[PDB]
Amino acid sequence: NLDIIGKRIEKIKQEHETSWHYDQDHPYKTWAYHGSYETKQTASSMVNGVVRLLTKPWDIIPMVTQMAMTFKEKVDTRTQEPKEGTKKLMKITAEWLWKELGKKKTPRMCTREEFTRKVRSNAALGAIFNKWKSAREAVEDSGFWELVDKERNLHLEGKCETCVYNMMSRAIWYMWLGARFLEFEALGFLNEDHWFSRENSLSGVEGEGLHKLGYILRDVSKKEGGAMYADDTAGWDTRITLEDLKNEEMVTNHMEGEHKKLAEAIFKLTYQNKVVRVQRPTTVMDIISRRDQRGSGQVVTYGLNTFTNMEAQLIRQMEGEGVFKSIQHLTVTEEIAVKNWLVRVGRERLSRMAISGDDCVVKPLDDRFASALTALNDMGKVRKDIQQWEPSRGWNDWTQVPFCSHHFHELIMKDGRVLVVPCRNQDELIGRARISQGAGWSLRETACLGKSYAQMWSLMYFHRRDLRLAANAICSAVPSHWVPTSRTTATHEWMTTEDMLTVWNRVWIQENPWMEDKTPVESWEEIPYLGKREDQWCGSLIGLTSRATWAKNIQTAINQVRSLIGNEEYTDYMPSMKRFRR
Numbered sequence: 001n002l003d004i005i006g007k008r009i010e011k012i013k014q015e016h017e018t019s020w021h022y023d024q025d026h027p028y029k030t031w032a033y034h035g036s037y038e039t040k041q042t043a044s045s046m047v048n049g050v051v052r053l054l055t056k057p058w059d060i061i062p063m064v065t066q067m068a069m070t071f072k073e074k075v076d077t078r079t080q081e082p083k084e085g086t087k088k089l090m091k092i093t094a095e096w097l098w099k100e101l102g103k104k105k106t107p108r109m110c111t112r113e114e115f116t117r118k119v120r121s122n123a124a125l126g127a128i129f130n131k132w133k134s135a136r137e138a139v140e141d142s143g144f145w146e147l148v149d150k151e152r153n154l155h156l157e158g159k160c161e162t163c164v165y166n167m168m169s170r171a172i173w174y175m176w177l178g179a180r181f182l183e184f185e186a187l188g189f190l191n192e193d194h195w196f197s198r199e200n201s202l203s204g205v206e207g208e209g210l211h212k213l214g215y216i217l218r219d220v221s222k223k224e225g226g227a228m229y230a231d232d233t234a235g236w237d238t239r240i241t242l243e244d245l246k247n248e249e250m251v252t253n254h255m256e257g258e259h260k261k262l263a264e265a266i267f268k269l270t271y272q273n274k275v276v277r278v279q280r281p282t283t284v285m286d287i288i289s290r291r292d293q294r295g296s297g298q299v300v301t302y303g304l305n306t307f308t309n310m311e312a313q314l315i316r317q318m319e320g321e322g323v324f325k326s327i328q329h330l331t332v333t334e335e336i337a338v339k340n341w342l343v344r345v346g347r348e349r350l351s352r353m354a355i356s357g358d359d360c361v362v363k364p365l366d367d368r369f370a371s372a373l374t375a376l377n378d379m380g381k382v383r384k385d386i387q388q389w390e391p392s393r394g395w396n397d398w399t400q401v402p403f404c405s406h407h408f409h410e411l412i413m414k415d416g417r418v419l420v421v422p423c424r425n426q427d428e429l430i431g432r433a434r435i436s437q438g439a440g441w442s443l444r445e446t447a448c449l450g451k452s453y454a455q456m457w458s459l460m461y462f463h464r465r466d467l468r469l470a471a472n473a474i475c476s477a478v479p480s481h482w483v484p485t486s487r488t489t490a491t492h493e494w495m496t497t498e499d500m501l502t503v504w505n506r507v508w509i510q511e512n513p514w515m516e517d518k519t520p521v522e523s524w525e526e527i528p529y530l531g532k533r534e535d536q537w538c539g540s541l542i543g544l545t546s547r548a549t550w551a552k553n554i555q556t557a558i559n560q561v562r563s564l565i566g567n568e569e570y571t572d573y574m575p576s577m578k579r580f581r582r
């Protein structure tokens with residue numbers, strides 16, 4: 001408690017000495033409350049006019065139009081201390097998992113230089129506005145780095161002054177850039193050096209890409225075993241226990257010198273003790289604390305989520321195989337059994353899973369996994385939308401399994417080669433492309449974001465008739481040489497001015513380890529679609545009058561957008577499709 005957070009608390013109290021008040025009508029039960037002070041402020045979602053003008057039939061589909069309009073009772077919940085047997089299973093598994101992840105990797109500090117280049121090419125390192133305008137500016141001013149230095153020497157003493165969270169099934173905890181640097185310095189290696197790559201972690205998919213995920217699920221399906229299980233957790237970040245945060249901190253056991261102490265301080269002072277400021281309309285800024293739950297940068301959150309999910313799913317697999325009998329208490333011979341299971345089959349059991357942060361697919365040895373619920377419930381990883389003790393409903397066909405908001409189709413090319421393609425409800429794809437984030441967008445920037453969506457569709461969703469047509473229309477309506485843009489940056493091969501057929505060939509043929517025959521595709525007409533009925537099942541408008549008029553008259557929509565943008569160099573991409581090729 002207050003010895004570790006007090007300094008952070010004391011500092012904030014004094015910047016607002018003409019405001020501090022210990023409110024007695026504060027809503028917090030599970031968060032420790034400290035005080036309040038005076039503020040007054042709030043960013044909603046704008047429509048992309050380039051995409052909307054070129055998707056007119058969807059103007060009357062509520063699933064699309066409703067996406068552009070507009071539970072904090074979950075962050076104010078408490079997770080119970082796991083039983084002693086559960087805690088022993090987690091500590092043993094965590095120790096073993098960090099060793100396996102560390103066998104072919106070296107922990108190392110990330111640098112000012114690496115951090116500087118990141119901010120100058122835009123990731124989403126959730127920072128704040130205020131002393132400097134953007135992150136871009138703060139990074140060149142050596143004053144900033146003196147601020148960073150002061151804090152860094154404080155962390156080496158085992159104390160913290162400025163590492164405070166700012167709140168805003170989505171609650172996002174922004175920190176000041178300096179605190180984000182110190183997090184990146186100590187823990188950025190997990191992401192930067194690909195600790196959760198499939199090659200290194202066996203369960204992970206970090207850096208894999210939406211064109212690989214389907215092939216990976218199909219490889220899991222080839223394993224002997226039962227159904228494929230894909231149970232979502234109800235609010236994963238809110239169910240991270242102090243026991244989880246301590247098993248995550250054991251990565252420091254693999255570190256040395258300065259790095260080890262710097263990483264130790266992030267875990268001790270910012271993760272296992274937290275200070276947060278929250279808006280409240282009744283507008284006072286509330287200063288609250290708690291030890292548990294997930295609040296890190298979104299990128300470190302991804303890696304530690306993947307780690308703890310890998311651990312939880314190996315333990316659920318142990319329970320199904322009867323490796324331990326009760327969570328209440330692990331016997332001595334049960335520890336040697338768990339240890340020997342990990343040594344003997346640990347890597348094989350990791351290869352049975354695909355895990356992306358809080359999202360998982362598991363193909364266990366058999367269906368006893370379905371009713372192996374005691375450790376999973378006791379770790380606080382309670383399944384979403386099923387009763388606590390009801391057995392999991394698994395999937396018999398890898399093509400129906402949900403993963404990373406997608407399902408995957410097996411699609412045979414006219415030449416016999418096999419594509420495993422990503423897919424989701426087409427209303428969701430069109431509805432997202434029609435939305436832009438933030439304000440001050442020029443017409444050119446709006447057009448370049450439309451082009452980014454269009455190129456993603458050509459590359460990932462070419463097999464959907466409506467998206468290949470709309471992608472070609474958007475790429476025809478935006479000047480040929482204008483560069484696709486985005487304000488936050490799965491591998492993004494569509495972010496390029498290269499010809500999309502050349503990128504398709506590189507991604508689906510040349511670089512595709514599941515494709516033996518490397519014969520390049522010479523035209524878009526070689527590249528197949530889903531069956532017509534499968535396309536409709538996944539949300540296609542083919543066979544509607546609205547869609548037929550849209551397709552037939554597409555050049556008129558293209559010309560509307562070209563007239564708005566003005567006299568620029570445009571390419572006609574519609575003759576890449578059979579029906580427009582005269």
Ligand SMILES: CC(C)N1CCN(C(=O)c2cccs2)CC1
Pocket residue numbers: 465532533536542543
């Ligand atoms: C059974 C149902 C899915 N329909 C089959 C016939 N049909 C077409 O042939 C096409 C029209 C426009 C492009 S393809 C529309 C869809």
Ligand SMILES: [Zn+2]
Pocket residue numbers: 151155159160161162163269
């Ligand atoms: Zn700090």
Ligand SMILES: [Zn+2]
Pocket residue numbers: 407409423424538
């Ligand atoms: Zn589909």
